[PDB]
Amino acid sequence: NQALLRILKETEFKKIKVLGSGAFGTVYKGLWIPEGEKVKIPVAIKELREAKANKEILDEAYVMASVDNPHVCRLLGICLTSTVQLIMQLMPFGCLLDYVREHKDNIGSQYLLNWCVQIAKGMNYLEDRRLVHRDLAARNVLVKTPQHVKITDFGLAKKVPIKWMALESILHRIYTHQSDVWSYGVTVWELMTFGSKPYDGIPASEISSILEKGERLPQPPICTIDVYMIMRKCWMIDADSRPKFRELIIEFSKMARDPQRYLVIQ
C-alpha cells in the first residue's frame, strides 16, 4: 500500500528544534509543511546516523507506515538523503519512562494499570501483524496524552538491552513474540517502580547468570501479589508458559476496573 507512506522532499519539513540524540541518531521537533496544502504540522523527525539499499529501507518503512492501532506509533513519512529521516506525529509528553519519573507523586493506580492495558494492546497488534519488537521498554513508549500512549522504535533493528531481553534471547539470540512478553514484564516493572532501573548496579555481563539462579526483579511495593505473579510469569524460562499478550490485555483490563484492589499507593 504505497499511499500509506509519504516520501518527503527536503523542502516539505524543517528541523525546528532538537529533542535528543543517542547512538542511533538524533530526534528533532519540527514542522511538516506539505506541498500545496497550506498547513504547518508539528512533527518529530528522527535522523538516523549516516550508515543498505533504498528499496530495502522503503520496504521496511512501508511496514512501519501500515500499522493501524491506537497504541502503536505509525511512520507518517520518510526522507532519503545521505541519512534516513523518519517523520511521525509529535508526542508532546515524551517517553513514558521520563514521564513517570517526572510525575511519580501524581500518578495513581488507574493511570498505571491503563498503561499496562494500552501497551499490551499495542503488542498484541504487533503480534497479529507477525511483528516482533525486540526492544520493548518504558523508554520506547511515547505519551501523546497522559492516558494515550503508543509503542515506538519497533522494527528499527531492520548495545543490546540485556536487562530487558528474555534468557533465550541473551543465550540463543532467539527473538519471538514470547520473548517480547518478557520485555513487557520488565516494562511493567519500570512503571510500577515509577521509573527505577532494572537490576540497578549489576553489569549486563552478569544478568544471564542471575536469571539462571532463579533471581528476578523484586516485587514493587505498590503491587499486590496478583499483579506481581503476572509479572513473574512473564519471566519464565519456558517461553511457551509465559502469558500471551491477548491474556495480558484481559487480566490488566479487569484489574483496571478496580485499580485500588490491585495497586496500593499512598
Ligand X SMILES: *CCC(=O)Nc1cc(-c2c[nH]c3ncnc(Nc4ccc(OCc5ccccn5)c(Cl)c4)c23)ccc1OCCN(C)C
What number of chain residues touch ligand X (CB under 6 A)?
23
C-beta closer to ligand X: residue 115 or 262: 115
Among 67, 117, 137, 153, binds Mg ion (CB under 5 A): 153
- φ, ψ for residue 216 (rounded to 5)? -130, 175
Of residues 63 through 102, those in contact with ligand X by CB under 6 A are: 64, 73, 75, 86, 88, 90-91, 94-95, 97-98
Q: Are 82 and 56 in contact (CB under 8 A)?
A: no
Of the residues 59, 135, 180, 240, which is catalytic?
Answer: 135
Beta bridge partners of 163: none
In 3D, which of 3, 13, 158 has the Cα closest to residue 85? 13
DSSP 98: H
Counting contacts by CB under 6 A, is residue 22 touching ligand X?
yes
Of residues 129 through 148, those in contact with ligand X by CB under 6 A are: 139, 142
How far is residue 67's CA from residue 73's CA, in Å, rounded to a whole number?
8
- φ, ψ for residue 13 (rounded to 5)? -145, 150
CB closest to Mg ion, residue no: 153
In 3D, which of 144, 254, 247, 248 has the Cα closest to residue 187? 248
Among 112-120, 151-159, 208-216, 227-235, the segment contacting Mg ion (CB under 5 A): 151-159
Q: What angle do CA 222, 228, 231 make, to 5 degrees?
A: 125
238 given a catalytic annotation: no
Task: For the CB of residue 7, give the shortest distance to ligand X in the complex, in Å.
Answer: 15
Active site amino acids: 135
Contact residues toward ligand X (CB under 6 A) are: 19-22, 27, 44, 46, 64, 73, 75, 86, 88, 90-91, 94-95, 97-98, 139, 142, 152-154
